[PDB]
Design a protein around this ligand. Structure first.
Ligand SMILES: [Mg+2]
Ligand SMILES: [Mg+2]
Ligand SMILES: [Mg+2]
Ligand SMILES: [Mg+2]
Ligand SMILES: [Mg+2]
Ligand SMILES: [Mg+2]
Ligand SMILES: [Mg+2]
Ligand SMILES: [Mg+2]
Ligand SMILES: [Mg+2]
Ligand SMILES: [Mg+2]
Ligand SMILES: [Mg+2]
Ligand SMILES: [Mg+2]
Ligand SMILES: [Mg+2]
Ligand SMILES: [Mg+2]
Ligand SMILES: [Mg+2]
Ligand SMILES: [Mg+2]
Ligand SMILES: [Mg+2]
Ligand SMILES: [Mg+2]
Ligand SMILES: [Mg+2]
Ligand SMILES: [Mg+2]
Ligand SMILES: [Mg+2]
Ligand SMILES: [Mg+2]
Ligand SMILES: [Mg+2]
Ligand SMILES: [Mg+2]
Ligand SMILES: [Mg+2]
Ligand SMILES: [Mg+2]
Ligand SMILES: [Mg+2]
Ligand SMILES: [Mg+2]
Ligand SMILES: [Mg+2]
Ligand SMILES: [Mg+2]
Ligand SMILES: [Mg+2]
Ligand SMILES: [Mg+2]
Ligand SMILES: [Mg+2]
Ligand SMILES: [Mg+2]
Ligand SMILES: [Mg+2]
Ligand SMILES: [Mg+2]
Ligand SMILES: [Mg+2]
Ligand SMILES: [Mg+2]
Lengths: 60, 185, 144, 67
RNA sequence: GCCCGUCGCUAGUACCGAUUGAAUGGCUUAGUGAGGCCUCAGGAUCUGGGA
RNA sequence: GGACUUUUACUUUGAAAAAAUUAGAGUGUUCAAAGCAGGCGUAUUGCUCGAAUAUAUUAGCAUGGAAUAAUAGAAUAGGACG
RNA sequence: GGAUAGUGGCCUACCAUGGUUUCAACGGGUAACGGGGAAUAAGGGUUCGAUUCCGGAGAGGGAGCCUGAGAAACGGCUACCACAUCCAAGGAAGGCAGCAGGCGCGCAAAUUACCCAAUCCUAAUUCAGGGAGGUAGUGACAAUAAAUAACGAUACAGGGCCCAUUCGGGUCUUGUAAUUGGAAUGAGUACAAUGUAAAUACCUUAACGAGGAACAAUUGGAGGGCAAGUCUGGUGCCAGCAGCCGCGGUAAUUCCAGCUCCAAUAGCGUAUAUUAAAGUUGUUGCAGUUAAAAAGCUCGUAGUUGAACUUUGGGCCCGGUUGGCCG
């Protein structure tokens, strides 16, 4: 079918999403120490058990 | 024109990439023995795997077959040697049983913690990789050292570093060079 | 017993039949006919580098409506002309005609992608430098 | 530190039986250094182009400087 | 509701096809035939029939 | 040593058998991938364990077996033993 | 008979009509050197092997040959064919599929370095020669080990627990913390010795060398398969995503981003190929009434296949290897 469609709009939405820069945050430990951080996050002190359990909730 | 310098790999990946249950069970191992990689678990479960194969293969030959008795005994004694296998179940249907944590329990990592001397699996790592602790007078800086029963008795800090005496070492020796320089002359 | 001879000497027959019927296997047939080497725009090889003739605007297949931004490439080892797609927003602004792109498969074993009719390839690098880079901004397009 | 040692029945039998770089390391032998290993090869190769002595081919070229 | 074919658009692929079309590579008839080797001669020179 | 012997398939054990590879023993390369080392004392004048084993098939060889499946034998007796 | 080192249609004379083939000859294709082997792991298999060892073949293509014990040799010669260099135009010279290095080719692959110290090879030979080979450089081909942090105090908060008539915190720590606290170590830098043929690195080790501005981990993904959001902002069937199913036309769980979250981690995506999954090539082990598939029918050669029956039963002796009850 058609092959000579407009090209004017190539790059449209990336070049019109407003920039917002990354935010500066505490650096996360690398290696072993991160696996540790996961262990205590996941399994040691736990967090919630609303119905079951979650991992990336926001407002619930 | 040389002899092929031979290698081989020492780990194996899980068939299924995202099995939530194996995933939990895996981290928990790391959390418990202070690992940094799933590989450190992959490594062992692979070791374990072949051992079982050796054991299976041997178990299908007849009882009191020559290879079976030779290769069977050899396997068992080597396992005992590092203190994985129980003195009682020293007859390879428990090498057939066995499991990963029986292996994990013998890393220098884990021994250097088990009888105090670290009081955390992680502090256990850091000490080992930092040239402290040794087996004889021979310093060991590899957490997966697999403590061989008859070496367990001789796990102390090394005759170097602090802890095992013979210097505090530069970062303290720095602060001690800040006391008789500021306050004194 | 249906079919297959069960005799003890019937090896030969049993072998031959297999050879015969392997031909009904799509891949085996492709392998031996050397379909790879023979037809197929690339050598049979993993990538191929060619040169950009015209920037195209391919209308997607239903139920999708879009213009898909592609490049006609004339492979360098081949002269064979091929139309390749140019992944990610913009990126078609990185190419230009006569430029030298590096093509690869679409991971469908031959066979075009999703709603792009006829395109069996994608761009991976222009002017020796990789789309991906140019997009993120880890790198800048060469002089000429 | 683990290493290897020898001890000779005399210095005469050391000096003859030892590697020649070892007698160097110690001091009982001069490094007599030479032209680069590849400078040397080229010496041999340039020499191949000449049959006989050489100097006789100097005088025949000492005529060349006329014609 | 489904749905069949001609007919019309764009694009792609393979076919048929004047050109007794073209190109590469392997053999190969017939003709011509280098060169060394063997062989009949030869005898610049150089000795005692030979070189 | 003479004089003669129906053909085979199967299977058993065995010879002949490169090394590295592989499987696998021994040895704490600090661990390990490796490597084939090494280990002991009188550490001033040497002591000593090693450098296995397995697989290696189809064919050829060599041997045990005689089920399973073939082959051949005596009917115009030109049969078999003496 | 000739020729050969020698057997032989090897070649020649004479004579004959043979040789091979559905048990696939002969011809074609091979993006074909063969082997040891490699990859995939229930087994049976499937795929691969230019390439570290063995064999073979070659030295731009063919043929010829000299020397010699051994070459039909190419870092030997001769010729032709194709390349191609030098020149005073008369002529002369060349063969990297040795080591490096250049061009070309392409998706695709490193230094115009050092040394004969080791391994070993050759010669008239302990000595010389060896781009064999070793040394270093380039090097995320693969493979091995595994840093990016460890520990107390404090500020509340807990969850415990004894008591609870009711303040509660106080002990034993679970840990989220915007002030704290001193310790440790190599990444690196570097006397030195070690290393080495001489160096470089490694192993040793004086002096240095960690607090967030690092000495600051990545690479993909977060609708399903498939581990991780229905957060906020942007776009509005556009731009793009999407292996596949599918998302996007104004509250996008999927695009462009921010935050947060997942998986693997000094490595992670992608493309191609192959292998497992695949009992979707099926000997083990497939399917064929209607999903793909029984030849219209019978005969029939090759091929595969093919009923039962022939020394069985009983008696005696010999000595082994495990295991019991005792030792
Ligand atoms: Mg068909
Ligand atoms: Mg076009
Ligand atoms: Mg080409
Ligand atoms: Mg020299
Ligand atoms: Mg000379
Ligand atoms: Mg056998
Ligand atoms: Mg062996
Ligand atoms: Mg004859
Ligand atoms: Mg005839
Ligand atoms: Mg056939
Ligand atoms: Mg080939
Ligand atoms: Mg090969
Ligand atoms: Mg092959
Ligand atoms: Mg090739
Ligand atoms: Mg040759
Ligand atoms: Mg060439
Ligand atoms: Mg020819
Ligand atoms: Mg030649
Ligand atoms: Mg050459
Ligand atoms: Mg040669
Ligand atoms: Mg002239
Ligand atoms: Mg070269
Ligand atoms: Mg590469
Ligand atoms: Mg020499
Ligand atoms: Mg001399
Ligand atoms: Mg060299
Ligand atoms: Mg870092
Ligand atoms: Mg810092
Ligand atoms: Mg999920
Ligand atoms: Mg919105
Ligand atoms: Mg939104
Ligand atoms: Mg997002
Ligand atoms: Mg992966
Ligand atoms: Mg079977
Ligand atoms: Mg089926
Ligand atoms: Mg049907
Ligand atoms: Mg029918
Ligand atoms: Mg029968």
């Amino acid at each position: 079918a058609k092959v000579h469609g407009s090209l004017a709009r190539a790059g449209k939405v990336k070049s019109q999403t407003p920039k917002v820069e990354k935010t500066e945050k505490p650096k996360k430990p690398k290696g072993r120490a991160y696996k540790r951080l996961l262990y205590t996050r996941r399994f040691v002190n736990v967090t919630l058990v609303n119905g079951k359990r979650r991992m990336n909730p926001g407002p619930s | 024109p040389r002899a092929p310098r031979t290698y081989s790999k020492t780990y194996s990946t899980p068939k299924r990439p995202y099995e939530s249950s194996r995933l939990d069970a895996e981290l928990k191992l790391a959390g418990e023995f202070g690992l940094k990689n799933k590989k450190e678990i992959y490594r062992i479960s692979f070791q374990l795997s072949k051992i079982r194969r050796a054991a299976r293969d041997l178990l299908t030959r007849d009882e009191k077959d020559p290879k079976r008795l030779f290769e069977g005994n050899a396997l068992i004694r080597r396992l005992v040697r590092v203190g994985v296998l129980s003195e009682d179940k020293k007859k390879l249907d428990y090498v057939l049983a066995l499991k990963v944590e029986d292996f994990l329990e013998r890393r220098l990592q884990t021994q250097v913690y088990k009888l105090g001397l670290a009081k955390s699996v992680h502090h256990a790592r850091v000490l080992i990789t930092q040239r402290h602790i040794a087996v004889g007078k021979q310093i060991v800086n590899i957490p997966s050292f697999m403590v061989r029963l008859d070496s367990e008795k001789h796990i102390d800090f090394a005759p170097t570093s602090p802890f095992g005496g013979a210097r505090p070492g530069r970062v303290a020796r720095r602060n001690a060079a800040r006391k008789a320089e500021a306050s004194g002359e | 017993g249906k079919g297959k001879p069960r005799g003890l000497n019937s090896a030969r027959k049993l072998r031959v039949h297999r050879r015969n019927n392997r031909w009904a296997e799509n891949n085996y047939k492709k392998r031996l006919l050397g379909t790879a080497f023979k037809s197929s725009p690339f050598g049979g090889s993993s990538h191929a580098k060619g040169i950009v003739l015209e920037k195209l605007g391919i209308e997607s297949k239903q139920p999708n409506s879009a213009i898909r931004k592609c490049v006609r490439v004339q492979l360098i080892k081949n002269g064979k002309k091929v139309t390749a797609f140019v992944p990610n927003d913009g990126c078609l602004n990185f190419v230009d005609e006569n430029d030298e792109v590096l093509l690869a498969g679409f991971g469908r074993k031959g066979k075009a992608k999703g709603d792009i009719p006829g395109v069996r390839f994608k761009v991976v690098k222009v002017s020796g430098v990789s789309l991906l880079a140019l997009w993120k901004e880890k790198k800048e397009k060469p002089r000429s | 530190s683990v290493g290897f040692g020898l001890v000779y029945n005399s210095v005469a039998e050391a000096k003859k039986f030892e590697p020649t770089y070892r007698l160097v390391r110690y001091g009982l032998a001069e490094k007599v250094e030479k032209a680069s290993r590849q400078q040397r090869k080229q010496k041999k190769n340039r020499d191949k182009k000449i049959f006989g002595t050489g100097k006789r081919l100097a005088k025949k070229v000492a005529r060349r400087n006329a014609d």
